[PDB]
């Protein structure tokens, strides 16, 4: 797979933390892991912002693939840009 959004700096940091919480061995983390990863990665967005974006993401049909959250989703969520 090849895709990204966050700048090099973040991409490196965000990825670092994500992996630490991506022990699912599938490549994607879980809801709980996501939120924890956001705060663990020393991100700007608060705690509710993340939990909200997620619960609101699949709220329609974003995580309908299974319910998990791959690094890709996290990034697109951290930047919140098409």
What order do the helices and strands come in, and which of them pair?
Elements lengths: L7 H14 L6 E2 L1 H10 L6 H11 L11 E2 H9 L3
Helix pairs in contact: 1-2, 2-3
Features:
82 residues, mainly alpha, Recoverin, domain 1, two-stranded antiparallel sheet, 4 helices, globular, Plastin-2
Shape: globular
Assembly state (oligomeric): monomer
CATH topology: Recoverin, domain 1
Structural class: mainly alpha
Helix content: 40-55%
Q: Please give the number of β-strands.
A: 2
What is the fourth-level CATH superfamily? EF-hand
Distance between the termini: 19 Å
Summed up, the helix count is: 4
- What is the CATH top level name? Mainly Alpha
Helix and strand sequence:
HEHHEH
Largest sheet strand order = 1-2
The Cα radius of gyration reads 12 Å
Q: Main sheet?
A: 2 strands, antiparallel
Domain module count = 1
User: How large a portion of the residues is in β-strands, by DSSP E?
Assistant: under 5%
Question: What is the CATH-assigned architecture?
Answer: Orthogonal Bundle
PDB class: metal binding protein
Keywords: L-plastin, metal binding protein
Assembly: monomeric
Entry title: Calcium-free EF-hand domain of L-plastin
């Amino acid at each position: 797979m090849a895709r990204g959004s966050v700048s090099d700096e973040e991409m490196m940091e965000l990825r670092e933390a994500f992996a630490k919480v991506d022990t699912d061995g599938n490549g994607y983390i879980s809801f709980n892991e996501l939120n924890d990863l956001f705060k663990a990665a020393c991100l700007p967005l608060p705690g509710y912002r993340v939990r909200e974006i997620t619960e609101n993401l699949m709220a329609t049909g974003d995580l309908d693939q299974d319910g998990r959250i791959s690094f890709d989703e996290f990034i697109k969520i951290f930047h919140g840009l098409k």
